[PDB]
Structures are given as structure tokens and as C-alpha cells.
């Protein structure tokens, strides 16, 4: 439809929320090697990371980062680029600053490295092909404004608003079967993702907020409003003048 944020944005959000990744290096004898790594990211999504090993003479490199959402789905990004020690002694201080703010930690400045981002591969979950994102679009994309409270709010809704969620499956999406279960998976500035279980199988649907949302109370409010409208429609107080979502994503 999509009613999702742009993949670039998702990649930035993943890079903001996560702190752990895998550095893919091309070792001495032409054999790939993946190494665990912590990282922080600057205002442009450029990852600075602490590496212990001897960098290697081939500088071509990848950083792979995952974000598991509600134990149900793991969006992923892989930054392809060239790793290098920072040039000046000033940028070393800037990066030590970002690393400080993120981790509240100090670290050997000779262990700081930077991946100049060539391009970013963004995947919605395991086993997807994923889409490529140019480095400048990745650079200018903003992290989702809801990212720090998405997990919490999804938990609260899943624990406290099952009646609303289940109702959403009826009034907001044009299903062709009986919903046996549902969970909210994630929520961002444009809407939220439901997993719907069924005798047929398991499906993922995206339901959009009526208007794009900016902060916590905006999201909560938007949700309340959608609950209210869904109830009023089910109790037949109101017409369903709006169109239902049709697009579904099959998941194993």
C-alpha cells in the first residue's frame, strides 16, 4: 500500500535501537569471517564501532544488524561499505563523544573504526530478499519518532486491548476467514502491524493510523480513536464508510 515507513527509515530506526551487530570481513586467505561487534551511529547513520582484531588489508566490509520485534519478527539491515580508522584527531573525539553518549563508556581510541556507508540492504524479516537503499537516502532518512516506546506500547496493547485488536481484524481488514488469534507486532509513525492466526495459516497485516503520528500521546490517542470507531461500528452505532485493508503477508 504501503502505509509503512520507507525502508531507509526502517534501517535508521534499526541502527538507533540496536547496539550489537556482525562485522563481515574478508580475511587473509580469501575466506569470509563474521565477528561480533558493538556500535553507535552518528547523525547520518554512519556506524562507528569498536573492533579488536587487526583490521585486515582489504577494507571492504559489512555490518549486519537485527531488531527483533515482540519475539515474532526480525527486521534486519546490512550496511555495505569500507571500514577504516578515522583520519583526523578531531573526528576521533566526535565519535568518542557519540560512543560516550550512547554507551556511557570510555574505550581505547585505537579500537574505534568507521564504516563509510556505500549502500544499505533492508529486510522485513528472515528469509526475505530485501531492498537496496542508496547511501544518501539512508543518510537523510530519520529514525521513527516512536521507536523508543514502540515495544512498550505494543506490550500494553497486547496485554490490555485484545478486544480492540480482535475487533480491528473484523472492521479494518477485509479477511476471508475466522481469526483464531492476534498480536500487535510493532507500531511506527504511520500505523501498526498485526499478526493474525487462522485455520488456514498465519498472516501479517498493516493497519494505518488515519493521520501520521508524532509522539507517544499522539499514537495512544490515534489508537483510542480507532478502537472507539471499531466498537461503534460493531455495535452498529456507525456506518463503515471507510475502505478495508486487503493486502496480507503470508508467514510460516
Amino acid at each position: 500500500s504501503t502505509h509503512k515507513p520507507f525502508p531507509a527509515e526502517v534501517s535508521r530506526s534499526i541502527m538507533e535501537l540496536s547496539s550489537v551487530g556482525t562485522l563481515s570481513t574478508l580475511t587473509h586467505d580469501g575466506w569470509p569471517l563474521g565477528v561480533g561487534v558493538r556500535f553507535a551511529v552518528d547523525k547520518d547513520g554512519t556506524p562507528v564501532l569498536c573492533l579488536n582484531r587487526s583490521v585486515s588489508p582489504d577494507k571492504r566490509s559489512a555490518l549486519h544488524v537485527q531488531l527483533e520485534q515482540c519475539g515474532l519478527r526480525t527486521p534486519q539491515c546490512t550496511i555495505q561499505g569500507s571500514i577504516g580508522r578515522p583520519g583526523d584527531d578531531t573526528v576521533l573525539k566526535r565519535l568518542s563523544a557519540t560512543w560516550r553518549e550512547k554507551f556511557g563508556e570510555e574505550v581505547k581510541e585505537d579500537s574505534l573504526y568507521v564504516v563509510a556507508v556505500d549502500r544499505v540492504l533492508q529486510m522485513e524479516d528472515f528469509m526475505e530478499d530485501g531492498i537496496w537503499v542508496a547511501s544518501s537516502d539512508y543518510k537523510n532518512a530519520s529514525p521513527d519518532p516512536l521507536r523508543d516506546i514502540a515495544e512498550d506500547i505494543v506490550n500494553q496493547i497486547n496485554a490490555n486491548n485484545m478486544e480492540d485488536i480482535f475487533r480491528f481484524c473484523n472492521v479494518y481488514v477485509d479477511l476471508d476467514f475466522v481469526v483464531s488469534e492476534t498480536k500487535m507486532i510493532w507500531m511506527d509513525r504511520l500505523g501498526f502491524d498485526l499478526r493474525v492466526w487462522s485455520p488456514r495459516g498465519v498472516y501479517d497485516v498493516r493497519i494505518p493510523f488515519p493521520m501520521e503520528v508524532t509522539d507517544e500521546k499522539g499514537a495512544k490517542s490515534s489508537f483510542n480513536g480507532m478502537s472507539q470507531l471499531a466498537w461503534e461500528v460493531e455495535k452498529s452505532y456507525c456506518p463503515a464508510d471507510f475502505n478495508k485493508v486487503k493486502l496480507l503477508k503470508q508467514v510460516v
Binding site: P210, K217, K220, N224, G225, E232
Partner: protein, 405 residues
């Protein structure tokens, strides 16, 4: 079981043409609390009505039905169809609602109403609420606690220091729209010498301005303003000379309370033009809701109109206090929120705390009848036995319930 609900329209969610229809002035607050409470699922009610907000706080039996009822009332009284309200409707329940009103009292949902005002307004909601029946215990408590939060954030934080207000933002917009000088060339006029207008003057003076023509009903209000701010020349003129003042003014500020506009297109079209030295445009900066300047006035080519909504143009503020004095407030608020929900949980004790001292009385009277000094003995025993559980926390209630029926 009953929920606290906030249902409203905000400057973020809805345009002034819609909000001013839902606006409810102080004199009509009690009437509204009565009607709201008349709805089937609304037990308590209050109305926070400002140029940025039209918010109804209710204690409600069912939250779905409460919201439906209140929305229908908003429609009935404003004239706006239920569907449009639903398009712009803001909705928060319970803890989220208390969080919301504390953030509002604390001045976090800028633009602020300037010096006190918003806090003084919540104060007024409690003050007018004093008499009113539908201003129940839960909502009275919520607002009182909100006044408290307002005070804590006020004193124990410098969030009030560099805070954008409607009035200052208005003066800033006026100055953004004018040409270039250490601007004293433009003839400033303020209509309404109340608090907001007084702030408009404070900020005019803060931007170097040295002369302003103030139009008002009370002359003594303007003399008092004159006495507080000697550094600026304040010319007082009565309401019935408004136009004559607009005629001699380049930018007009309107900050009076009036249900019908002061300036219409017909009033504005035959005014002399503003000086070329300031662009040859008259600027009507209208910070009142409902608006003091007609919507038609913008159709005058040499005239411009700005209302409260347009103050969004000045969100530009040099502040690293974006979270600093906002997390300083956020702490106080996350503290006082729990400190309030605790209180609401404590309010559930009253039925048990009553039935207990009813049961004990039945026992002491039924025993005193088999008895017949001693009548004082019974009271002594019962009251000394009751001083324990009656002062004590929910597990106590759940214990006494199954222990006494």
C-alpha cells in the same frame, strides 16, 4: 471500574474555525458540567478551555459509551457533525489522561499562556468547580494535583525561563512579517489590556518598541500597566475608538474576549493604508479564541490576518531545553502521576471503610441491648479496636471483605 477520560480538540489536531465553535467561556463552565453529567455514563465532569485547547475531563462508567455520549454532546452544542469531531478528536484514558493534564499544567504542551495563566486557569477550573455538583471527587482531585504539579515544575525547574508564549510568539510573528529596521517605525496597537495583551506589550518592549496604543474598557487597567512598564509610552484609548486606533496603526493585536468578531471586512476595507515604510500592509495579529478578527478580513488586499494557529510559524526557539527542562518536568510528572493513581486506588476503600463501622455498630448495639458508663464502654472498645484497620493497602480491603461479608 470507572475511567478518567479526556476528550478534546487541540491546536495540534484541529483548526481554529472548528475549535472556536467548541469554545466554552468561564461563565458557562458549570452549565456544561451539569449537561455532561446528565449523560448516562458520565459521573463527573470538567472543562479546560483555552485558545489552544478544548478539553473535557470526565469520570465515566463505560469508556466507550462515555466517549460516544460526550462526543454527541460536543456535536449538539457546537453544531459540528459528529464525524468531523471524530476526525479531529483527541482521546486519552486513565493514567494517560492524568499524564496529559499534568503536562498541560506544567507548560510542556507549548505554546504557554505566559505568566501563570494556564496554571491560574486550572486554578480557576477548581475555583468555579467549587460550587458545581458534577465536579466530583476524582476530577477535583485530578485538577488539584495538576495545580500542584504546575507549582513543582514552576519552582523546582527553569522550564518557565525560556518558554514560548502565545503573546511573545504573536509579537515575534508580527516582527517576522515586517520589513527591516530596529523596528520602531511600525505603529503598534493592542486591543485588550488583559493578561495576554499585557504580555504582548511586555514583549513589544522587549523587542525595543517604545510606543504602543492600548485600547481597553477599563482605563485604570491600562494606567496600572503604564505604572508597571514606565520605559514604554502607553497611550490609552477607549473601546469606541478601536477603528480610529486601527486606522493609525500598522499592526493591530487583538486580545479581548468577544463571541462575535471586532473587525469585519467592511470595517477594515476603508481604513487608510499602512505606511510604505513598513511594507504598506496592516497586520492583524489575533490571539483570541473565538477570533476577534473576521475571516473575511483577509480578503482585504492591503491587510493580513494571523490567528493562534499561525503562531506555529514561530516554533523556532533557541533551546537545548527541548528535553533538559522537559525531562526536569518529566520526572516530577512521572512521580506525581503514580502519586495520584495511588490516591484514586485509595478512593476505592470508602465503601468498605463505611460498611466496617456499620457492622461494628450493629455488634455494639445488639450487645448493649442484652446488657441493659456501659454505653461509653461499648464506644471505647469498638473505637479502640477500629483505630487499626481503618487507618490502613488494598489487601486490607480484600481481607475485611471476606472476613466481614
Amino acid at each position: 471500574r470507572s475511567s478518567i477520560v479526556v476528550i478534546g480538540l487541540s491546536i495540534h489536531t484541529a483548526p481554529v474555525e472548528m475549535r472556536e465553535k467548541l469554545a466554552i467561556p468561564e461563565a458557562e463552565w458549570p452549565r456544561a458540567i451539569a449537561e455532561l453529567c446528565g449523560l448516562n455514563h458520565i459521573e463527573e465532569a470538567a472543562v479546560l478551555s483555552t485558545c489552544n485547547r478544548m478539553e473535557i475531563y470526565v469520570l465515566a462508567l463505560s469508556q466507550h459509551r462515555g466517549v460516544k455520549e460526550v462526543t454527541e454532546w460536543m456535536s449538539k452544542t457546537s453544531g459540528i457533525p459528529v464525524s468531523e469531531i471524530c476526525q479531529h478528536r483527541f482521546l486519552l484514558y486513565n493514567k494517560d489522561a492524568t499524564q496529559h493534564i499534568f503536562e498541560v499544567s506544567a507548560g510542556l504542551d507549548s505554546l504557554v499562556l505566559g505568566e501563570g495563566q494556564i496554571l491560574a486557569q486550572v486554578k480557576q477550573v477548581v475555583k468555579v468547580g467549587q460550587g458545581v455538583n458534577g465536579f466530583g471527587r476524582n476530577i477535583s482531585g485530578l485538577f488539584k494535583h495538576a495545580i500542584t504539579v504546575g507549582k513543582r515544575v514552576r519552582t523546582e525547574t527553569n522550564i518557565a525561563s525560556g518558554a514560548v508564549s502565545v503573546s511573545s510568539a504573536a509579537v515575534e510573528l508580527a516582527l517576522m512579517k515586517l520589513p527591516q529596521s530596529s523596528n520602531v517605525s511600525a505603529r503598534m496597537c493592542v486591543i485588550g489590556a488583559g493578561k495576554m495583551g499585557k504580555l504582548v506589550i511586555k514583549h513589544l518592549m522587549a523587542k525595543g518598541c517604545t510606543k504602543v496604543v492600548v485600547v481597553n474598557r477599563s482605563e485604570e487597567r491600562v494606567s496600572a500597566i503604564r505604572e508597571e512598564m514606565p520605559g514604554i509610552e502607553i497611550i490609552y484609548r477607549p473601546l469606541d475608538e478601536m477603528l480610529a486606533c486601527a486606522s493609525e496603526a500598522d499592526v493591530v493585536f487583538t486580545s479581548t474576549a468577544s463571541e462575535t468578531p471586532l473587525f469585519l471586512k467592511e470595517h477594515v476595507e476603508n481604513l487608510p493604508q499602512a505606511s510604505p515604510e513598513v511594507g504598506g500592509l496592516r497586520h492583524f495579529v489575533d490571539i483570541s479564541v473565538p477570533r476577534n478578527v473576521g475571516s473575511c478580513v483577509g480578503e482585504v488586499e492591503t491587510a493580513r490576518v494571523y490567528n493562534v494557529d499561525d503562531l506555529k510559524e514561530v516554533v523556532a526557539a533557541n533551546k537545548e531545553d527541548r528535553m533538559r527542562k522537559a525531562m526536569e518536568a518529566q520526572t516530577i510528572i512521572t512521580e506525581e502521576s503514580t502519586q495520584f493513581e495511588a490516591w484514586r486506588d485509595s478512593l476505592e476503600t470508602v465503601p468498605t471503610i463505611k460498611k466496617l463501622r456499620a457492622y461494628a455498630e450493629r455488634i455494639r448495639v445488639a450487645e448493649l441491648e442484652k446488657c441493659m458508663a456501659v454505653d461509653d464502654l461499648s464506644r471505647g472498645i469498638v473505637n479502640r479496636f477500629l483505630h487499626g484497620p481503618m487507618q490502613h493497602t488494598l489487601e486490607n480491603m480484600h481481607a475485611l471483605n471476606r472476613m466481614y461479608g
